[PDB]
């Protein structure tokens, strides 16, 4: 599982940066939606994401 | 209330085991506590076995089954 949980953990992290006439606003983001056990890659789906 | 409308199609399917001679006895079908070994193994393939006292009905559809047991 060593090669799995880190990529599972990271891929909800994002930044939305809105450049506008008056400046830039941005938020680092992190999805609350977990990866779907029913539709992710079918090789291996450990629950270590929820463990972390 | 919208949050309580699920994001997925919920279905509730009854499952009945009919023993010998119970083909016309509702009370006997519903009285069944055990089943043939093939029926037990058939149940195991229907889905995840979820212990109700660990379930949250907003997250896992229980269809009206009580968490209290």
């Amino acid at each position: 599982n060593l090669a799995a949980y880190v990529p599972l953990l990271t891929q909800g992290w994002a930044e939305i940066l809105v450049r506008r006439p008056t400046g830039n606003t941005s938020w680092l983001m992190s999805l609350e939606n977990p990866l779907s056990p029913f539709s992710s890659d079918i090789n291996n789906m450990p629950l270590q994401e929820l463990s972390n | 209330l919208l949050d309580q409308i699920p994001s997925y199609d919920t279905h509730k399917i009854a499952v009945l085991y009919v023993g010998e001679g119970q083909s016309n006895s509702e009370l006997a079908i519903l009285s069944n506590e055990h089943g043939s070994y093939r029926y037990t193994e058939f149940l195991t393939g229907l889905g995840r076995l979820i212990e109700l006292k660990d379930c949250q009905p907003d997250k896992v559809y229980l269809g009206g089954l009580d968490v209290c047991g």
Binding site: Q48, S51, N52 | H34, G35, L49
Partner: protein, 50 residues
């Protein structure tokens, strides 16, 4: 008379299958308990390192 024997044996088989349901339900219950214990142990190791 053999019908009486058959009904007696069917009663015995019904109680045996009640015992089978009891045994299999205990198997399921303790299997979920040990699954929870295994999850707890793995989570505990990961949590200590974290």
């Amino acid at each position: 008379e053999l019908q009486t024997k058959l009904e007696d044996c069917r009663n015995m088989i019904a109680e045996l299958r009640i015992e089978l349901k009891k045994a299999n339900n205990k198997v399921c219950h303790t299997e979920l308990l040990l699954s929870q214990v295994s999850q707890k142990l793995s989570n505990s190791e990961s949590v200590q390192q974290q």
